[model samples]
Target: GSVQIVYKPVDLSKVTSKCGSLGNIHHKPGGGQVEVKSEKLDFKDRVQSKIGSLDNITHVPGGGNKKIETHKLTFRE
Candidate 1:
C-alpha cells in the first residue's frame, strides 16, 4: 500500500547572500574593513521526503570556543 502526497521541490537558486566584513584597523591598517554577502535558508518543514537538508548551526562568537560530545552505537540481531 502507498499513500498519496504532494510537495514542491526546493528552489536553491532563489537563495540570496547577505554578508559583511568587520576588520580591525588597529591590527591591520590595509585591512581596515571589507564586505561579504551570501544567501541562506532554514529547513524546519522540509524533512518528510528523505531529502537532504542542513539543521540549525551552533556557532561561537567573540573569542570563544565550543566542544562536541560523541556517542557510540551498535546494531543487534
Candidate 2:
C-alpha cells in the first residue's frame, strides 16, 4: 500500500444531517470550541476532532503552525 497526503479546508456549515451537525461554535482571537450535533455516527468528524485535539502541539519553537494529524476511522455495518 502507498500513502498519500492532502490537506483541504472544511466548512462545518456545509455538513448536514442529524448525524453530522455542529452547533454554536465559539471563536476567540485565534481559536475556540465548537458544539457538534450527531447521533448515528460519522467517521469524518471523529477524525477531524482528533486532528483538532493536536492544536497545542508545537513542532517548531517560536513558530505556531500547528500540524494536523488524522487516523483512519473504519465503520462496520
The collision pairs in model 1 are: 16-39, 17-38, 17-39, 18-38, 19-36, 19-37
- Best by the TM-score measure: 2
TM-score of 1: 0.20
Question: What is candidate 2's CA lDDT for residue 63?
Answer: 30
Per-model TM values vs. the true structure? 0.20, 0.22
Measured by C-alpha RMSD in angstroms, how accurate is candidate 2?
Answer: 19.2
lDDT of each: 0.47, 0.48
- What's the true lDDT of residue 6 in model 2? 73
Alpha-carbon deviation at 53 in model 2, angstroms: 4.8
Which residue segments of model 1 deviate by more than 4 Å?
Answer: 1-25, 29-60
Clashes of 2: 0
Q: Write the per-residue lDDT of candidate 2 for residues 1-77, one digit (tens) a residue.
A: 86665756565543222334434544445766866555665675436434323244423233334445565755454
